[PDB]
Design a protein around this nucleic acid. Structure first.
Lengths: 70, 104, 66, 259, 117, 88
RNA sequence: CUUGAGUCUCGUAGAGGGGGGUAGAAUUCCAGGUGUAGCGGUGAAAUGCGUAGAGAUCUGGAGGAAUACCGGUGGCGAAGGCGGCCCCCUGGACGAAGACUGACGCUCAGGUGCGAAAGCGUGGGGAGCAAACAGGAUUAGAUACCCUGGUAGUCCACGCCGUAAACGAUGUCGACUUGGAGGUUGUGCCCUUGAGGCGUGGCUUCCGGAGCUAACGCGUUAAGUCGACCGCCUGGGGAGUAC
């Protein structure tokens, strides 16, 4: 996330840009992930579980949507 | 026999020595009835990251249909030769005679 | 919306650095096939090419390193 | 018999997929929903806003015929994509007509450049063009009487992404998105883009030849968090948006709307 | 002491404590300050405010060097990350570059085990 | 795997028509050659278990073929086993 | 005899296996520079490391281990499992047409092999992590959870061990029975007029019909409808223990 302040650019704006860049990188997230050792099994489980959740969100909810709430 | 594709990188202070080296390499290939389908001196080039403390290096591409013994020999030569920093002998299916996109 | 299907390329080239550069991050990382919309078969090839390039110092492993 | 088989291939022959054949007769009007029947499986729920012309009031009663569009079938129940896009093809045909005699003539009136090219509006629609196209020379329509009447002489069109810059006054004078993503780049180039779907965090305005923009929720207005983008703008509407940010790598052009 | 116009601010932002170190462009440290040093302990020093004040302190310390331009290198995850740089800006250096320099391995060493809480 | 040319040669020798290829005897020969080739490999690479599985399978197949030959036509089988030098 | 089974031709994708090289990031240590009082850690602390100059920061070196991004209810493998890049040796799968062989097949008690992790033996290696151990907390106690350290081990070679919720808790092989939405990998035709259109094969994720089921659920990858062979069960404990 290397950044250079442009000529006649505000500080705040620059900071914001930097933040955005960082977010894009996913650096903080990566750091968080590597704080502690995740057993392979655990890693697998999370990934599959997450996937399942995503699938549920996509399809079941869509089905629900077809019918009106009131 | 087997169509290899070689790219080796020479140290930029030895850039005037490069042609001779290339010739030598070619000669060896020829020796075992090996063809050399393309050969492209890319020249001095800025490295994406400084390998062995230096920022530029001299890239040579070379495509060869040769037996594997000769390839092995070439590799050995590269490894011991201190002028050549990196090499990357790399198999290929066909002869691929047409020029590279960075030459064009 | 894959590029390589439309172009109809047989194999992605590590030497074709410019092309690679579209699929690499500002931070050097290889861009996901969700974002680029690259076909799966091609994506792997592209990745491989990028890796090769990195070995040859044609592409950088990362933005920071020097 | 084969009467029906022949009738089927006949009816295949006498329809096409896009909004091309002006076939749907308006068979019920109620504010705010028009509805047609172009020989499809169901009737369209048409907005009223694809059919009022240039000052706000409706133009077509019962029996009237506009084609709509297609290639999308069944979201649960119903049939179409809107006929207003239909209209775009007609506009494209008129723009194309230029090529024949190397001069399309209508009226073009362009007061100012959102992103470096005066805006030209033809009939109901208004389009944005690159900065040169508005004036033949360095004349500049800022000194001209505001929203002046000329025509449009075309300067530049982008051929994939739809941006057309046209020539006001001077009657006498006569893979693919992502490599060179530096055209609308530089900091704040305003664009005219139709929104597609508002994902409760976003709005997804994306027009410029196969890209994706967001204008997510933070700008959108001059209130931050309580906004809910469906209330505040639209669905399917061409708006004020500019880039504010491009990553050509993780294809996320992050546009804005608070400007 | 020799005055220097341009330098780097290294911001080591941990979860527990922020450390700001102003150095010349070559690497040689001029001054430093910490949230733990600024009179904050435990709960307090792991905060943005603490980080900011550390930064301020650091800035104060490198007054004699007469530093106008400054590039910032931000390391680690923490509260003292945005705040610290803001503080620095306030203190009145022209911030030139804002770099992130978190050490991300490319899967190298095994991290320590996960805490059971 | 066995090189194309080698395979062709094998086919020509053992096969009656030379276009045949699927003759039991021919198949056996092909198997046998492959086995022979792989012996060298496996002397070197004793822990290559996965590869060895394939070899084992091939051997089994060959054995089966031999058995089949035996019940059908004994003389031919005998000839084959003389040619290849298969103890059984 | 050719429909099962196999052989040949040309391609295809692949973390399939074995061997040998190499690359970059990061941690640790060593040497040196800059620099000055804290660092570290937690819920909060303390042990611990620090003015014998730590932490921070820059330069150079050593060494080991693992391979960010790609990366996906993606792929390959009989299962166990397999993930940077390159080369060498090597097994399987699938498709396209043909050509050939002509039931050569399926299953399998004993038997033989492969078989995570930990563990064992001998010889190497040892960065990080960490059973044991030590100290600091917490607590009524704390032979734990948390913290600071930390040795076997993890890594390599060659042997042994032969077990795991070794799971889809679902033996293998074959046939037959409504559908939808995908993923992946071929391949035939079609104006590829464009990212497409119409098929046809392989493997695969989810939902659901008939039917089945104690229900939960399974549902063309069956737990449906059948056939072939094998393995196994007969109340709970005692016990997968004793001899």
């Amino acid at each position: 996330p290397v950044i250079k302040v442009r000529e006649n650019e505000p500080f705040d704006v620059a900071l914001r840009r930097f933040k955005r860049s960082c977010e894009k990188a996913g650096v903080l997230a990566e750091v968080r992930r590597r704080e502690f050792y995740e057993k392979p099994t655990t890693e697998r489980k999370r990934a599959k579980a997450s996937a399942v959740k995503r699938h549920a969100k996509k399809l079941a909810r869509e089905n629900a949507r077809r019918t009106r709430l009131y | 026999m087997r169509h290899y594709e070689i790219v080796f990188m020479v140290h930029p202070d030895q850039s005037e020595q490069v042609p001779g080296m290339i010739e030598r390499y070619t000669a060896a290939i020829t020796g075992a009835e090996g063809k050399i389908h393309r050969l492209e001196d890319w020249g001095r080039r800025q490295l994406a990251y400084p390998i062995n403390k230096l920022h530029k290096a001299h890239y040579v591409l070379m495509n060869v249909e040769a037996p594997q013994e000769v390839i092995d020999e070439l590799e050995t030569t590269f490894r011991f030769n201190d002028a050549v920093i990196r090499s990357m002998v790399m198999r290929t299916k066909h002869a691929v005679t047409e020029a590279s996109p960075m030459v064009k | 919306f894959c590029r390589f299907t439309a172009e109809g390329v047989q194999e992605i080239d590590y030497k074709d650095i410019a092309t690679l550069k579209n699929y690499i991050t500002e931070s050097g990382k290889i861009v996901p096939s969700r974002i680029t919309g690259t076909r799966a078969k091609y994506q792997r090839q592209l990745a491989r090419a990028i890796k090769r390039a990195r070995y040859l110092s044609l592409l950088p492993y990362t933005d920071r390193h020097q | 018999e084969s009467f029906a088989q022949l009738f089927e291939e006949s009816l295949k022959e006498i329809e096409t997929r896009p909004g091309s054949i002006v076939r749907g007769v308006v068979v019920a009007i109620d504010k705010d929903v028009v509805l047609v029947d172009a020989g499809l499986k169901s009737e369209s729920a048409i907005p009223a806003e694809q059919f009022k012309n240039a000052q706000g009031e409706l133009e077509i009663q019962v029996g009237d015929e506009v084609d709509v569009a297609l290639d999308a079938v069944e979201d649960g129940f119903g049939e179409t994509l809107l006929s207003r896009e239909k209209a775009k093809r007609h506009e494209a045909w008129i723009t194309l007509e230029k090529a024949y005699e190397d001069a399309e003539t209508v009226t073009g009136v362009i007061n100012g450049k959102v992103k470096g090219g005066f805006t030209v509006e033809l009939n109901g629609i208004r389009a944005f063009l690159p900065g040169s196209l508005v004036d033949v020379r360095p004349v500049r329509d800022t000194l001209h009487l505001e929203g002046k009447e000329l025509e449009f002489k075309v300067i530049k069109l982008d051929q994939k992404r739809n941006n057309v810059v046209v020539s006001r006054r001077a009657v006498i004078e006569s893979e693919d998105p992502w490599v060179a993503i530096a055209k609308r780049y530089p900091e704040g180039t305003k664009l005219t883009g139709r929104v597609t779907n508002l994902t409760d965090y976003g709005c997804f305005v994306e027009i410029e030849e196969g890209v994706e923009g967001l204008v997510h929720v933070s700008e959108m207005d001059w209130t931050n968090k309580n906004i809910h983008p469906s209330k505040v703008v639209n669905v399917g509407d061409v708006v004020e948006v500019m880039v504010l940010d491009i990553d050509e790598e993780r294809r996320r052009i992050s546009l804005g709307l608070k400007q | 002491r020799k005055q220097v116009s341009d330098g780097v601010a290294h911001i080591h932002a941990s979860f527990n404590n922020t450390i700001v170190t102003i150095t010349d462009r070559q690497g040689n440290a001029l001054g430093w300050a910490t949230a733990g040093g600024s009179g904050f302990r435990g709960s307090r020093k792991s905060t943005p405010f603490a980080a900011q004040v550390a930064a301020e302190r650091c800035a104060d310390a490198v007054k004699e060097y007469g530093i106008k331009n400054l590039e910032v290198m931000v390391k680690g995850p923490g509260p003292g990350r945005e705040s610290t740089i803001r503080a620095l800006n306030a203190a009145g250096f022209r911030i030139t570059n804002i770099t992130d320099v978190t050490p991300i391995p490319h899967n190298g060493c095994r991290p320590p085990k996960k805490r059971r809480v | 795997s066995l090189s194309t040319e080698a395979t062709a040669k094998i086919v020509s020798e053992f096969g009656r028509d030379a276009n045949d290829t699927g003759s039991t005897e021919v198949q056996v020969a092909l198997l046998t050659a492959q086995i022979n080739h792989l012996q060298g490999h496996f002397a070197e690479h004793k822990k290559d278990h996965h590869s060895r599985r394939g070899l084992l399978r091939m051997v089994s197949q060959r054995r089966k073929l031999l058995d089949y030959l035996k019940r059908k036509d004994v003389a031919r089988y005998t000839q084959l086993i003389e040619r290849l030098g298969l103890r059984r």
